[PDB]
Paper text:
Most of the dimers present in the cryo-EM sample have a basal state conformation. The dimer consensus map has been low-pass-filtered to 7 Å in the same manner as the H2O2-activated state map, and no additional bridge density is present. Basal ATM forms a dimer through two key interfaces in the C-terminal half of the protein. Under basal conditions, ATM basal state is proposed to be in equilibrium with a rotated, PRD-displaced conformation, with the equilibrium greatly favoring the basal state. There was no density for substrate peptide in the basal state particles in the H2O2-treated sample, but in the population of the activated ATM dimers (in the same sample), we observed additional density in the active site for the 12-residue p53 peptide (p5311–22).
Ataxia-telangiectasia mutated (ATM) is a master kinase regulating DNA damage response that is activated by DNA double-strand breaks. ATM belongs to the phosphatidylinositol-3 kinase–related kinase (PIKK) superfamily, whose members share a common domain architecture. ATM is directly activated by oxidative stress in vitro and in cells. Overall, ATM emerges as a key cellular sensor of oxidative stress, initiating a signaling cascade to respond to and alleviate deleterious oxidative damage.
Residue numbers in the entry:
A (entry chain A): 2052 to 2112, 2121 to 2386
B (entry chain B): 1549 to 1876, 1899 to 1974, 1984 to 2112, 2121 to 2386
C (entry chain B): 2555 to 2573, 2591 to 2974, 3001 to 3056
Write the structure that this text describes.
Amino acid sequence: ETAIPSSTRQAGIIQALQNLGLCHILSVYLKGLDYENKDWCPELEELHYQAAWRNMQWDHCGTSYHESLYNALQSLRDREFSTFYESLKYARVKEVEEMCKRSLESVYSLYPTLSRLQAIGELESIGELFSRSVTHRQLSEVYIKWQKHSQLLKDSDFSFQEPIMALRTVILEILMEKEMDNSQRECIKDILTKHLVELSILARTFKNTQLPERAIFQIKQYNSVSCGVSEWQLEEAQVFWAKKEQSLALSILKQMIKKLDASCAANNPSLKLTYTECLRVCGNWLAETCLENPAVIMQTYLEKAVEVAGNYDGESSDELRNGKMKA
Amino acid sequence: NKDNENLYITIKLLDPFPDHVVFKDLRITQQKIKYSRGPFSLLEEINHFLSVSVYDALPLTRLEGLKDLRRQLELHKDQMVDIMRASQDNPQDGIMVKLVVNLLQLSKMAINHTGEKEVLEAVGSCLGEVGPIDFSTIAIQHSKDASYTKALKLFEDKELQWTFIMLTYLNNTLVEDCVKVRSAAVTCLKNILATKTGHSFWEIYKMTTDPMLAYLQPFRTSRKKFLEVPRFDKENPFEGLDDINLWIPLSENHDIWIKTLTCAFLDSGGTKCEILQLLKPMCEVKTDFCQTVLPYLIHDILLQDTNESWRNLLSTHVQGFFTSCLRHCCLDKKSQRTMLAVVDYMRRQKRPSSGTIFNDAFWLDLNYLEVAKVAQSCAAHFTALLYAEIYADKKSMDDQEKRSTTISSLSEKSKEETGISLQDLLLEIYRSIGEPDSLYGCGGGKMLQPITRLRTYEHEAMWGKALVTYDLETAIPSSTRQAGIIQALQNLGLCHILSVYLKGLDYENKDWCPELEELHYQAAWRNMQWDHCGTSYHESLYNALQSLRDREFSTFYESLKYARVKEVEEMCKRSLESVYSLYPTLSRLQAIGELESIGELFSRSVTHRQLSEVYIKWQKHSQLLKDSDFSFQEPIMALRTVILEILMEKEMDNSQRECIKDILTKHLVELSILARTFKNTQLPERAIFQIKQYNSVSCGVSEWQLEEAQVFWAKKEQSLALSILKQMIKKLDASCAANNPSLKLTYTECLRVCGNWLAETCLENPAVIMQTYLEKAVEVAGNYDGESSDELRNGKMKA
Amino acid sequence: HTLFIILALANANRDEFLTSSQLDEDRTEAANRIICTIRSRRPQMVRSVEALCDAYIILANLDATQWKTQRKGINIPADQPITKLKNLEDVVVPTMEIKVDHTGEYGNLVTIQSFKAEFRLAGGVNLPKIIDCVGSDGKERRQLVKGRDDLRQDAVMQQVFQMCNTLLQRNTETRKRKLTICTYKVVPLSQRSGVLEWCTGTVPIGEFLVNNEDGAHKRYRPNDFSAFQCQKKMMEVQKKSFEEKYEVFMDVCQNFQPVFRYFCMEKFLDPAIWFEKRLAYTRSVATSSIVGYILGLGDRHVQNILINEQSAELVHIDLGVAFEQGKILPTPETVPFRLTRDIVDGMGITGVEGVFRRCCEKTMEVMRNSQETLLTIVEVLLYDPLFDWTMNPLKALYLAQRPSFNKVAERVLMRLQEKLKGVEEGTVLSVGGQVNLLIQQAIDPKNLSRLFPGWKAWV
Ligand SMILES: Nc1ncnc2c1ncn2[C@@H]1O[C@H](COP(=O)(O)OP(=O)(O)NP(=O)(O)O)[C@@H](O)[C@H]1O
Ligand SMILES: [Mg+2]
Ligand SMILES: [Zn+2]
């Protein structure tokens, strides 16, 4: 459609593109618009800044929300803490101002501001950790705090949670691209991998398939394939299952099970939960697809998962108790 | 000599003379001598055209016949439906597909010859009249001489069959310009016919009727003592052939390689048959003869092989040659094809020991996996597939014997032994074949890599999934990374997005590869971006469209002529073995032909009758493509929409442009219906929008509005579709009063569709649905008394 | 197309004439009235055909048990009236398929000219006679005459195959793949004897594979177990435990490798032709298996399946058992269709994956999309008074030998309906899921072990 005003025409296009991923396409599409048009309206300025910080286009460089967020991230990159807090303070003070002049009658009107203020607070909270030395204990507490606040948003809409998760991924990945000569960056890599797995799970719940695929790709950038399988690989099989690709999901898990059988010998407690869950999921998928007889499914996948969870005697744990119940 | 009865048959089959004043008198004589029996139908014209091909192998002499064949195909498109309706029972020998193969073979013969441009253009024009019609066949077959095949059946002895093949080749090579070849051949005829085997050949072959017998009468002589071929006992017959350098010189000199390899076999004392020893002088002057005789020589040696000494020597040398092909050295394609013919010939021969066909496939101890890869490299797709199955079967039997495994498992051993993955090899073999169902047979290899996933999405028309994967993955080469992106964007519509995306790429990159010219030109002409302004296909199409607007007809025909010629040349150099390879060429040639046909209408005055005939011709040819894939029909429909829109943007001060508007509206409705059938929703929505640009909303509803409701129904939006039709029915009730016959069909269909939709959605009780929608549709079509029509009869049946 | 139909009804009791319920006499009397109405305007055609029909019945009633060991051809006795009749220009060959035209005038049709004096015999519990019919064009046609058997059930099954063929043709998805069912004309002549088309150029799959003299298994795998050895072992474990049956079946399958893939290799040396024939074979098996499952076809043993030598397309014969009556046998049929190792091996290295699975899915989609049509046709068949599709102890014992109607029809219709909607075990299954279940059940070794040895599951 072309009769729609141009100002909102590309606003919807950019917003639709972002929700489907297509980060490279959106970047080129934004560049094409700037080439053909010299006048640069603020609402297109708002989206361009939003895409720049989401895609880590750090070479692009009153102030608006995404402009402050993009400026603060570069200030975080350059260790310019004086302006980093000032930009966040201006954004925090600004965002309340529009909320003041509204009607304040509908609860749904408060949600976009609360999500934005939460994102500002998380960026401010991680700033003190960035300024001082990086330690495992501080990183674990921040992730635990993020997880505890995330479960409080379990009933929130995906539109109010996605920007929060996007900033968390950007913040964590900014930490990794910092110089670390202490060789302890694996802690951040594990935290980012866990965060991206949670993002894939959250997006899968809201019937979204493009975002989980992007999260899996981001994980594979910082992770590799080894003898000991990991949880994000299992998440990829679940993501492909949600994409109505049953052959792809089953092939991933069958390869994963074969590797687990050859690798572990009831010696790794960490791989015990992954092995038990993977056998249970594959058996359920085969039963639903009716691609195997009940005798083989029970003998190879279902009872094997129960045997692995029970006979290994790796007791005294809470996750394993949940694993046995599902098995 | 028209009255001559013995010359009556041949004068009928000669090619028509060119249309000129000097050839006047001969023309009426030929037209009468051919049409003496009566008028020829389209099938008879095709059958007559094919018979002339087997006589003379000069494409220049067939130029007039190609133009004549084009005329019949253009004005007899109605009979092609009946011809196809007569050939689905046996589609292997379909008449239409044989014509396509024969024309392409004729184009190959015209390559590297004087006057090759006009003959290729005529073939392309002929291949433009018939599009990518589903021939219901996968493998391309070549015409074979029935008499030659019959003559082979007469001789039972293998040596006698060897004699007939050689003399037939020797008789054939007696008419070339070379005099040394002729002298060498005649000496061979004297030597072969003087032997006992040649004498035995004549007695068996004299019963049948063949001109070669009369040609060989002077060479034959009667002697009391039969010619004796001397036999020499070499001290070590294997020293000549036991040379790795001799088998693989490969110094970019195939002519001397085949000659030296053949000569070494002749000088070896292993050969027992007498006729072969006498072929040396002819082998030394022709390389083609050496390639032909080589399988017979190798077959001959293994017959009297003792203690498997020759078999072991040949097995390791042939295998060594094949292993050299798998390197990266840089062997010529001619050498590999010659050895493939040797392997293929030996596979059809019965071994002296009693056995089956599987045993006969192992005359030499060869690894068929390497041969299959070479065959795939030589574009022998079906040959490679058969060899791969033989290789897998042999190793499975070998493994079972050794012990006294799935496709993924067997491929693992193949990779660790010879470096070739069997399951990976089977992938491009099936892709080269192009059969859609066979692609799923071997897919377990390389599941997770994005490249394999992207082809699956493109094959299944999952353009949204492919678009996301293309953007996400970065390790894929950039040249094909965007090539998929523009291709995926175009199939989803997004014309404005694609235009901006293309502009963004040009801004960030200065170096510009040619395959991005092809897509940018494709998008420019599809989106009517006329301000963008060897030559490629879409470049010629875009240039011709601008030439069409500017009324520059001299370059418009020249650009189309160059595009038509260029398409055939790329078509000639391929394998020409798979029918699916023909479809992309036929579809592009059809689009060129349609644009050329419109040019004459555009140049002269525009009239209602001319436009109506063109649309009837378009619809007549469109239903011939009803079984074609959407990928081969969409570009044709896209060009039709553009050129119709080019006509509308022209100035018309006669106020008769409503005729073109109606044709475009009908064409876009058909495009929406065709896209809806192929489970496409973006294209029908775009077609509806294009209709609304040139159409409005009035008291009298139209058919495209009903199409929009059907499009929205296909988009799983039932409330939108029902609301459109309910408003449409309400206007129809108030507007028409059983006075407009045109609105009768629309009103009857609309009530029937809405009632069916309500029944499926269960949004209304049965009593109201019958009283308001179903019986009313029957009533409207029934008591209006607008009879004497065919569309109403179809409408009444549906109601 | 109808004159042979009415005479067969009117000649129900002519078998004993040449040598029950009130509905029988009423049908016979009404059929006679139609014949007299037919004979009123065209008497020469009626008299000519009934003479041909009588000749077939007399020829069928011939015992001819002495020439059981002869396979070269036996001269027809001069007492048979079929030899006397010649040049029947008013009789169209019943074996041939007659195209139906809108106009009432029929012209240029192939008529019966004469019959050859030599007839052959086919193996079986009875001795059917193979005769040659010469048409007007002079082209010989082979006809199979069967005695002591009901041929009306086979004729009914042929029409359903035509409906399945017609349904597959009108869908673009299956018309592109040329998914069709091989059919042969069946012309019943009485309640006890009949004549049917003989598929020229076709050989039984069992004759090609497990022949004692020149079987495919013997020729290609001499070191493996012989066909007799495998048959003997299965019969021994018949009166044993289920576990013993399973381990015997695995042991036999270990020493019996499929060799059916060599059928196309030895008959089509050209790689292009060989690929076409193999693709046609895979498509034919996939189409027949889905249709056979839909109609509940049973007793699909080696001798009931024919393969065309020229076209490599499977032909299904002996269609008396259908509508899942095979599960009612003393040895239940636990496989919807025959997908043994030989069948899968002939499909190529890919096996069931690829062409076979996609073609099965495409066929199932057509069956699902035409559910209302398919259910209506079966409803007409199931209420036919003369259609004896229900299983009886006499038929059950004959099929497996060793040395209220309304409630059943409704249950069969309900079972057919749930199949067409994808309901298998009370759950809704998609086309892909249903096809996967059918393929898995057919190739399951455990189900094959329970089956009757005469079905030759290992083959
Ligand atoms: N229509 C046919 N076309 C070709 N061959 C056929 C045909 N019908 C039967 N045969 C052959 O006849 C053999 C015996 O089968 P058949 O004629 O059905 O007698 P049968 O085995 O006794 N069947 P039945 O009488 O029901 O027990 C088969 O193995 C085929 O080789
Ligand atoms: Mg039988
Ligand atoms: Zn090289």
